[PDB]
Design a protein around this ligand. Sequence first.
Ligand SMILES: CC(=O)N[C@H]1[C@@H](O[C@H]2[C@@H](O)[C@@H](CO)O[C@@H](O[C@H]3[C@H](O)[C@@H](O)[C@H](O)O[C@@H]3CO)[C@@H]2O)O[C@H](CO)[C@@H](O)[C@@H]1O[C@@H]1O[C@H](CO)[C@H](O)[C@H](O[C@]2(C(=O)O)C[C@H](O)[C@@H](NC(C)=O)[C@H]([C@H](O)[C@H](O)CO)O2)[C@H]1O
Ligand SMILES: CC(=O)N[C@H]1[C@@H](O[C@H]2[C@@H](O)[C@@H](CO)O[C@@H](O[C@H]3[C@H](O)[C@@H](O)[C@H](O)O[C@@H]3CO)[C@@H]2O)O[C@H](CO)[C@@H](O)[C@@H]1O[C@@H]1O[C@H](CO)[C@H](O)[C@H](O[C@]2(C(=O)O)C[C@H](O)[C@@H](NC(C)=O)[C@H]([C@H](O)[C@H](O)CO)O2)[C@H]1O
Ligand SMILES: CC(=O)N[C@H]1[C@@H](O[C@H]2[C@@H](O)[C@@H](CO)O[C@@H](O[C@H]3[C@H](O)[C@@H](O)[C@H](O)O[C@@H]3CO)[C@@H]2O)O[C@H](CO)[C@@H](O)[C@@H]1O[C@@H]1O[C@H](CO)[C@H](O)[C@H](O[C@]2(C(=O)O)C[C@H](O)[C@@H](NC(C)=O)[C@H]([C@H](O)[C@H](O)CO)O2)[C@H]1O
Ligand SMILES: *[C@@H]1O[C@H](CO)[C@@H](O[C@@H]2O[C@H](CO)[C@@H](O)[C@H](O)[C@H]2NC(C)=O)[C@H](O)[C@H]1NC(C)=O
Ligand SMILES: *[C@@H]1O[C@H](CO)[C@@H](O[C@@H]2O[C@H](CO)[C@@H](O)[C@H](O)[C@H]2NC(C)=O)[C@H](O)[C@H]1NC(C)=O
Ligand SMILES: *[C@@H]1O[C@H](CO)[C@@H](O[C@@H]2O[C@H](CO)[C@@H](O)[C@H](O)[C@H]2NC(C)=O)[C@H](O)[C@H]1NC(C)=O
Ligand SMILES: *[C@@H]1O[C@H](CO)[C@@H](O[C@@H]2O[C@H](CO)[C@@H](O)[C@H](O)[C@H]2NC(C)=O)[C@H](O)[C@H]1NC(C)=O
Ligand SMILES: *[C@@H]1O[C@H](CO)[C@@H](O[C@@H]2O[C@H](CO)[C@@H](O)[C@H](O)[C@H]2NC(C)=O)[C@H](O)[C@H]1NC(C)=O
Ligand SMILES: *[C@@H]1O[C@H](CO)[C@@H](O[C@@H]2O[C@H](CO)[C@@H](O)[C@H](O)[C@H]2NC(C)=O)[C@H](O)[C@H]1NC(C)=O
Ligand SMILES: *[C@@H]1O[C@H](CO)[C@@H](O[C@@H]2O[C@H](CO)[C@@H](O)[C@H](O)[C@H]2NC(C)=O)[C@H](O)[C@H]1NC(C)=O
Ligand SMILES: *[C@@H]1O[C@H](CO)[C@@H](O[C@@H]2O[C@H](CO)[C@@H](O)[C@H](O)[C@H]2NC(C)=O)[C@H](O)[C@H]1NC(C)=O
Ligand SMILES: *[C@@H]1O[C@H](CO)[C@@H](O[C@@H]2O[C@H](CO)[C@@H](O)[C@H](O)[C@H]2NC(C)=O)[C@H](O)[C@H]1NC(C)=O
Ligand SMILES: *[C@@H]1O[C@H](CO)[C@@H](O)[C@H](O)[C@H]1NC(C)=O
Ligand SMILES: *[C@@H]1O[C@H](CO)[C@@H](O)[C@H](O)[C@H]1NC(C)=O
Ligand SMILES: *[C@@H]1O[C@H](CO)[C@@H](O)[C@H](O)[C@H]1NC(C)=O
Ligand SMILES: *[C@@H]1O[C@H](CO)[C@@H](O)[C@H](O)[C@H]1NC(C)=O
Lengths: 169, 169, 169, 342, 342, 342
Amino acid sequence: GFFGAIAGFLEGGWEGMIAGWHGYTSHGAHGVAVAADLKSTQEAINKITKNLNSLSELEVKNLQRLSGAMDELHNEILELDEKVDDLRADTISSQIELAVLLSNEGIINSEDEHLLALERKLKKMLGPSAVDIGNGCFETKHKCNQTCLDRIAAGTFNAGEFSLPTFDS
Amino acid sequence: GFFGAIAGFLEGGWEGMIAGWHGYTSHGAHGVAVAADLKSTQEAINKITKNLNSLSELEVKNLQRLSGAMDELHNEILELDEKVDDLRADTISSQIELAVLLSNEGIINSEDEHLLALERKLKKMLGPSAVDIGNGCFETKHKCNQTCLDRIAAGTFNAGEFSLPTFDS
Amino acid sequence: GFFGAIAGFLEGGWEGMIAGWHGYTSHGAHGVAVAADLKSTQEAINKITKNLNSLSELEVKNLQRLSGAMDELHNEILELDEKVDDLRADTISSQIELAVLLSNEGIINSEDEHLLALERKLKKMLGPSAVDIGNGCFETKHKCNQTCLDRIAAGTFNAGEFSLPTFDS
Amino acid sequence: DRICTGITSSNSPHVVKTATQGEVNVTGVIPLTTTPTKSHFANLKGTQTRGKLCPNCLNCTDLDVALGRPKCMGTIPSAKASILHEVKPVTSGCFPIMHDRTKIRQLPNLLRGYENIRLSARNVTNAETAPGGPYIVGTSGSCPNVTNGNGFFATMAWAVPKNKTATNPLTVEVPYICTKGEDQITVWGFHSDDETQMVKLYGDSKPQKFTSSANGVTTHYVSQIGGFPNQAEDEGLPQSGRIVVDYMVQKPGKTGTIAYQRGVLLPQKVWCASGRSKVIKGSLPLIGEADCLHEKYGGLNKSKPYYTGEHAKAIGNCPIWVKTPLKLANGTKYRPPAKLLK
Amino acid sequence: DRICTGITSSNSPHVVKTATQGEVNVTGVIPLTTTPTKSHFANLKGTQTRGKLCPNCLNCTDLDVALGRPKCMGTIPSAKASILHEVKPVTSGCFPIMHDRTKIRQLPNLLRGYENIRLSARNVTNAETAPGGPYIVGTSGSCPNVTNGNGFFATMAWAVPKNKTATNPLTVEVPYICTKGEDQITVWGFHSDDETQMVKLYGDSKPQKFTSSANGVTTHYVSQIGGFPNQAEDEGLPQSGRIVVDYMVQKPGKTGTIAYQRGVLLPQKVWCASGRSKVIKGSLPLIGEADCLHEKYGGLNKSKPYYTGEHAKAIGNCPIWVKTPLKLANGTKYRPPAKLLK
Amino acid sequence: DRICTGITSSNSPHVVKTATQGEVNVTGVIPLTTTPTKSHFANLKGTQTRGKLCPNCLNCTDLDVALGRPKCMGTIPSAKASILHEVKPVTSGCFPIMHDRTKIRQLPNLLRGYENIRLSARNVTNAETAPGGPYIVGTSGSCPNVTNGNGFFATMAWAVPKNKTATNPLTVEVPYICTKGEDQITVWGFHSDDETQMVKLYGDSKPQKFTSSANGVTTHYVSQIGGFPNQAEDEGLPQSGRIVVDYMVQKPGKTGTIAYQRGVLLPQKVWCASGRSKVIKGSLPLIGEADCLHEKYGGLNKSKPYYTGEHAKAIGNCPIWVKTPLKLANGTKYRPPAKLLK
Ligand SMILES: CC(=O)N[C@H]1[C@@H](O[C@H]2[C@@H](O)[C@@H](CO)O[C@@H](O[C@H]3[C@H](O)[C@@H](O)[C@H](O)O[C@@H]3CO)[C@@H]2O)O[C@H](CO)[C@@H](O)[C@@H]1O[C@@H]1O[C@H](CO)[C@H](O)[C@H](O[C@]2(C(=O)O)C[C@H](O)[C@@H](NC(C)=O)[C@H]([C@H](O)[C@H](O)CO)O2)[C@H]1O
Ligand SMILES: CC(=O)N[C@H]1[C@@H](O[C@H]2[C@@H](O)[C@@H](CO)O[C@@H](O[C@H]3[C@H](O)[C@@H](O)[C@H](O)O[C@@H]3CO)[C@@H]2O)O[C@H](CO)[C@@H](O)[C@@H]1O[C@@H]1O[C@H](CO)[C@H](O)[C@H](O[C@]2(C(=O)O)C[C@H](O)[C@@H](NC(C)=O)[C@H]([C@H](O)[C@H](O)CO)O2)[C@H]1O
Ligand SMILES: CC(=O)N[C@H]1[C@@H](O[C@H]2[C@@H](O)[C@@H](CO)O[C@@H](O[C@H]3[C@H](O)[C@@H](O)[C@H](O)O[C@@H]3CO)[C@@H]2O)O[C@H](CO)[C@@H](O)[C@@H]1O[C@@H]1O[C@H](CO)[C@H](O)[C@H](O[C@]2(C(=O)O)C[C@H](O)[C@@H](NC(C)=O)[C@H]([C@H](O)[C@H](O)CO)O2)[C@H]1O
Ligand SMILES: *[C@@H]1O[C@H](CO)[C@@H](O[C@@H]2O[C@H](CO)[C@@H](O)[C@H](O)[C@H]2NC(C)=O)[C@H](O)[C@H]1NC(C)=O
Ligand SMILES: *[C@@H]1O[C@H](CO)[C@@H](O[C@@H]2O[C@H](CO)[C@@H](O)[C@H](O)[C@H]2NC(C)=O)[C@H](O)[C@H]1NC(C)=O
Ligand SMILES: *[C@@H]1O[C@H](CO)[C@@H](O[C@@H]2O[C@H](CO)[C@@H](O)[C@H](O)[C@H]2NC(C)=O)[C@H](O)[C@H]1NC(C)=O
Ligand SMILES: *[C@@H]1O[C@H](CO)[C@@H](O[C@@H]2O[C@H](CO)[C@@H](O)[C@H](O)[C@H]2NC(C)=O)[C@H](O)[C@H]1NC(C)=O
Ligand SMILES: *[C@@H]1O[C@H](CO)[C@@H](O[C@@H]2O[C@H](CO)[C@@H](O)[C@H](O)[C@H]2NC(C)=O)[C@H](O)[C@H]1NC(C)=O
Ligand SMILES: *[C@@H]1O[C@H](CO)[C@@H](O[C@@H]2O[C@H](CO)[C@@H](O)[C@H](O)[C@H]2NC(C)=O)[C@H](O)[C@H]1NC(C)=O
Ligand SMILES: *[C@@H]1O[C@H](CO)[C@@H](O[C@@H]2O[C@H](CO)[C@@H](O)[C@H](O)[C@H]2NC(C)=O)[C@H](O)[C@H]1NC(C)=O
Ligand SMILES: *[C@@H]1O[C@H](CO)[C@@H](O[C@@H]2O[C@H](CO)[C@@H](O)[C@H](O)[C@H]2NC(C)=O)[C@H](O)[C@H]1NC(C)=O
Ligand SMILES: *[C@@H]1O[C@H](CO)[C@@H](O[C@@H]2O[C@H](CO)[C@@H](O)[C@H](O)[C@H]2NC(C)=O)[C@H](O)[C@H]1NC(C)=O
Ligand SMILES: *[C@@H]1O[C@H](CO)[C@@H](O)[C@H](O)[C@H]1NC(C)=O
Ligand SMILES: *[C@@H]1O[C@H](CO)[C@@H](O)[C@H](O)[C@H]1NC(C)=O
Ligand SMILES: *[C@@H]1O[C@H](CO)[C@@H](O)[C@H](O)[C@H]1NC(C)=O
Ligand SMILES: *[C@@H]1O[C@H](CO)[C@@H](O)[C@H](O)[C@H]1NC(C)=O
């Protein structure tokens, strides 16, 4: 979004991460590797689910016929009742449209936060020998092919597998 | 939140920071130290206060009796007036519920931003010798017991107290 | 905002960036240089524009005279129609006020995200020899006068112009 | 070597609304909208449904039951949901009414509006001792009995005067009569006939005047003697004459007043009704059950929170109407596939 | 060595609503809601309150004052807030009225609706020179004076005809009469009595007809001669007869029309009323002051922006009603205490 | 050496609303609000406008055309937007009407409410063969022709009876008559005159009674014989008498009923009207065009999405009303200029 554009991220879809929406790429002699973090995506899928539950709680009074207003005798009242029904329908509809809009904007705008979160998960497990660019990317002192990358998406990685330093819990 | 979960922060309450909501921990030979930043919390408390003032500005027309509609002669009108009163009450109530919901979501979601702010306040005053993990934590070249930690919460710290480099204003 | 206050940014206007709203400063022997990123500001100006288009889509039923209600014979109905018209006007007005408020809050709060984006654009092009403080600022191993700074705002900078390392695309 | 964070590129046919970014394309969406289809009406789940004022006083009209027709007199229950199936209900016989000269047609639709309704617990006004001469409570064929004979609406007394004579307006004072804070719906009217038959049954052969007053509302009628309208909604040939019938709504504790002359069908059995039932325009073979009754779409059960279509009155657990189909973004803003990298 | 950022763990009994996270627990909350309690009514602060149409024409009813009763004639002010204390107001004597045969009861409640009201600046229609024979403006005991005598509602003239004779309907034309763009509320009626007394006071002993027309609205009455209802809301025994009284609302610049016969209580002193006062159903010993008058809860002053409870009409500086108690999160989402660290 | 990120300091005269930060100052703002100015009314763009019921039956009133005046009979089109210019319309001659005794004045304003209107396709009720004696369809000067003569409202027949005799109430039964699901607006009335002239034209010189019934609504009139009101909205001196006129709205398929005596202006040419036109109070020299018609501000074209000012009914492509002027922040929160740096 506006963040990714300014802070030169790549507005780059990576067709290939069949699973998750967000994850990691990986670049070198091996070419380009691709992975999807299975926690960023289940966290995104959960948010949306709850938002759906929130959106589906709204209760609004039923809206029925006037009890004492008769179909041929009180037509001028009944007309004003049609008007009332219509204006209600319109007002709440416009409010519902607003609720969803805000909802959507939020869900959409969140992605760049996932990316920024995913990036911090990476900075930790790549260790202190790595170099944070600002891109959402890291210059590493070692190669990272698909098996290495898959281990970053799983959270099962050790900079130390390849004799480099590590942050210990 | 969804940020802290993905970007492996600790979903960890630190009972013990009796004062602030957010602050710093500290880990080593001394065990675990705990501090609360008294600026992150007064900034959070202010936001909430203003939001309360915003929520309390909403003016809505009074809603009273029909002047020309008489209690025994115009009952079919008076009924439609009951309906109108009820539908108003309902519509605005639902709007108010939405305003507060958005308000709440915002107040809640903000915490991870405070944490991310607090962390930048720390990166500066720990100096260039420290190592940012991605956790919201720092590997330091010196010990930090409660007196050291309390000085980070106060903003009265000097990496240089313990002969290490510093960023100068 | 609340971020800049906690994470010690400067609540500092830089009168002088006549162009953009957000950009870079620059500090040394030369004094203080100032620049404005022409992408952060056009991205901000676009957001606002769209928000304006969103705010201007809302359609609301016309609100006219009752067809069968006559000016001298049905005054008690016509009164209830005045009440209905007034309550509609009031409800939607209050909703519109809320839509814009949220809009404003968003537009305002975004600035600290631009700053945080701009900062990542900088971290990359200053190269690995620089030192990120946490301030939104960088300690560099070289001088940066107005011509240097102007080249960071343009995205046409090379740490390597002054023999230092670089991140290559 | 670079290890980056990235997002996917995928099939994003769905477009969504966004305040900051305008209309954006999205991987997936959870739709919140639906356009229901016109189906039959059913039993509103949590409440109880009506449509026939009475089930066990079978083969009748609603109006017939309203009017207190001899066989159409079933002890009728409650609902809290009601269906309005005939906007302009019809009678199925008895004495020929000139329906269109009063608001009487809607009487059932009014009654329907209440939760609790009941035929009577008495009859208000002594038909015999009524002001004006002693009356013989006229009865008429064209309105059979449980046993056959001559019928006249439990509702009203056909006050035919012995001592046949013209009369200056007489006033009855129809009292409240009911239990609880119920309403009373009093029903009444006036018979008229041809020149000759008028003098026969009552001692006068000229237009007869009738005026009622209840809750500040006044009505005034003038009888017709000749050329009655081509009989309809009747049975079989007391065609000499017709009945104009009207109703009077007495709120709790209030008295009604009928000024009348000759042909007066005095009130007798008076409705008491209470509570409020939720009413809606429908069609009435009520098959099975739904969650929410929609005036158009009809029996309809909630799947999604919002619905698109025709707005209309609806009762029960209903989805809320919405101008446009609405979708909840369940995915990522569309990004083109990337080799714009080095 | 690690120096981290953390948030607190604390007592978080309060639950809050959140779109993304569902219902979450929170350190503290600022409640925005309250359930007020039923207390008495009071003086709406910023405006001015009513409840008694008149204070200094003491010991009376509102209706009595409306009708223009002899002692109940106080020069009565304005409000912009009014309390409706009697839904069906009563009279406290004078000549016995048959209240229930017209809308007259609500006359005060109508008047109450205006800001500015006034007894009269004249009297409309010459009682003596009124169409029909010269009248002697009847007066009656049962309606004392400031000095005792015989009273008859400043409102209306008891047009008793010398030259006692039956009369075909006569038309008066009640003119506008008022200042400004006020409304006019004309009041009128007809006296009726027993057979004998009718012939005595007026030369006719049969039901008398009365028809009025104002702003396209027509009403029609027929007098009763015998068996008047058990006198109530009266004083002392002119029980031979009763008065049926009605009112007529003349909008600015418009003329009313009464067709009448014998017993006609012509109009005389006519109300002019203007402005709009905010009215509400209340109970009327008005003790002290509040910020906002609630039909149920009553006198009630604003503490929090929203309120829970029974919705009802309310005027003044009121909190706005809300379906459910609402809280503003003032703290942090609940986190369990942490040793899930190494 | 430091290279930082910063934001500008600038002229920030505009203040904006923010939930978290209270009221903040801002570099620039895009205003969404405007206070339009009172200007004349015009042609609603997307639809079609009215104001004169008829253009080519020129020099008349709307009421005149409504009443079916001889020259004021133009074949009149449709709109879907209508302007209500006279709240209480006037007649421009023909036979003197006593306007204020019925709802008749508003007849045009009612008609205006429909999209499709039409003078007639026949005339309902045989004026000659009408119940009561054979009538000679009276015509009157004071109502010229295309050629001069004597006119009487296409609307109604001046049923003057040969065989001059008093009559007990006679009933006509005004039938539906119309095409489609249109409405019918029947118009009728009664002529009255001075003592002498009444006996001349009709064999009776006493107040004549008239009662109508349509869609459950009853009206009742009593004629005046003497001292008619100072003639106004007339032409020239048949001042002996006047006409009281009324209208009757027949919904689709429904029958009306007029009980009448002497002076009966029977109905004849009956309106059929259908569709719904959007109506608003305006002033009618309709100059040029606008986007949206506002009751106050009038012809007004949309610039900004919201407007400040007086709320009022408005039709067409209108900006939506808003309590307060609203601005969209287009810039940065005010920051003071900085040397608070080292
Ligand atoms: C009403 C009546 O008596 N009609 C019977 C009769 O009709 C014609 C016949 O009388 C004939 C004699 O000269 O004259 C016709 O009169 C008119 C003509 O209609 C006009 O067009 C013309 O202008 O003037 C003529 C001269 O005046 C009569 O039309 O004959 C028929 C056929 O033989 C009989 O069916 C009629 O008798 C009535 O029949 C019905 C069933 O169809 C009922 O059985 C009637 O019995 C009741 C009833 O059930 O309604 C019995 C009730 O007890 C009684 N109620 C009271 C209060 O007395 C009623 C009531 O009188 C009538 O309904 C009034 O119309 O009748 C049975 O009388
Ligand atoms: C009305 C009247 O004169 N009543 C007085 C009287 O009543 C009985 C008595 O006349 C008796 C004589 O035969 O007959 C009874 O008549 C009926 C009986 O009621 C019926 O049930 C039966 O069917 O037929 C009988 C025969 O016709 C009378 O009921 O006696 C009582 C007791 O002695 C007197 O109080 C009655 O006189 C009236 O008293 C009241 C106070 O109670 C007033 O003082 C009356 O004075 C006024 C008044 O103040 O209202 C004076 C007004 O000037 C005058 N107005 C006009 C316009 O003339 C009115 C008005 O006439 C009456 O109110 C009409 O009822 O009276 C005083 O006359
Ligand atoms: C109605 C009439 O004949 N008036 C003409 C006449 O008026 C005075 C005159 O008759 C005089 C004779 O003694 O008496 C006055 O009567 C009253 C007086 O008004 C009262 O104040 C007092 O209390 O009692 C008196 C005695 O009864 C009359 O006022 O004289 C004038 C001047 O010469 C004539 O203009 C009057 O004739 C009518 O004039 C008008 C035009 O001004 C028309 O031309 C009339 O012609 C029509 C019409 O066009 O309306 C022709 C129609 O065919 C006819 N309709 C029917 C159904 O018959 C109508 C209708 O009769 C009248 O309008 C009824 O008023 O007249 C023309 O007659
Ligand atoms: C994004 O979605 C739009 C529609 O939501 C896609 O374009 C549409 O193609 C379908 C295919 O039949 C048509 O029904 C629509 O008419 C098209 N859009 C419009 C507005 O006309 C579009 O291809 C999707 N993907 C991308 C990458 O834009
Ligand atoms: C009032 O209700 C009673 C039943 O409770 C009705 O019953 C009979 O009506 C006939 C009419 O001819 C009378 O002769 C009887 O005296 C009534 N009682 C019986 C069955 O013996 C009565 O009709 C009702 N109203 C009337 C018309 O008085
Ligand atoms: C809406 O929901 C209800 C579920 O209760 C459906 O009601 C059932 O109708 C089916 C018809 O196939 C019957 O077999 C069942 O007997 C009914 N409910 C049960 C399980 O007892 C209803 O049909 C649904 N659909 C609509 C649109 O009405
Ligand atoms: C969070 O709050 C809820 C209530 O808001 C706490 O659980 C409640 O315990 C109270 C104690 O009496 C009960 O009144 C409620 O019924 C309980 N909740 C419900 C919904 O039943 C809960 O203990 C709080 N703290 C945590 C850590 O969840
Ligand atoms: C009209 O108002 C006047 C006072 O302004 C009323 O006063 C007197 O009424 C009596 C009735 O008997 C008349 O005889 C007097 O001529 C009136 N004036 C006085 C006091 O001398 C009058 O009643 C009012 N309306 C009527 C009934 O004409
Ligand atoms: C609501 O607010 C007003 C404050 O003006 C209260 O009015 C006061 O009532 C107290 C009763 O204790 C009196 O002592 C004062 O004289 C009144 N106001 C003053 C200070 O002059 C009112 O009582 C409050 N409470 C409610 C619910 O009505
Ligand atoms: C921020 O804006 C406010 C107004 O929006 C500025 O102060 C206003 O000065 C103008 C000048 O005529 C006055 O019309 C207003 O009355 C002043 N404000 C108020 C609320 O009274 C203010 O100077 C602007 N800039 C800053 C830095 O605050
Ligand atoms: C009914 O419509 C006809 C025209 O269609 C009217 O026309 C004439 O009315 C005069 C009245 O004197 C009659 O004598 C004629 O018989 C009618 N036809 C013609 C022109 O020869 C008629 O007036 C309308 N209604 C009435 C009054 O019957
Ligand atoms: C509102 O918008 C319309 C634009 O269509 C304006 O209508 C034009 O009026 C001008 C008057 O200067 C004429 O010259 C044009 O003939 C009209 N439209 C065109 C271009 O054909 C209208 O004047 C605008 N302003 C208001 C407030 O009514
Ligand atoms: C900036 O420094 C460069 C040399 O690196 C020089 O060419 C230029 O003139 C300087 N700009 C100013 C205005 O001092
Ligand atoms: C049915 O009708 C007869 C006479 O028509 C009547 O006497 C009888 O009471 C009725 N049936 C009943 C109630 O047993
Ligand atoms: C009170 O009543 C008497 C007669 O009953 C009347 O003459 C007098 O005018 C009244 N009092 C006044 C107005 O002085
Ligand atoms: C105009 O009036 C005359 C008589 O007044 C009438 O006969 C004629 O039909 C009318 N004009 C027409 C319709 O030709």
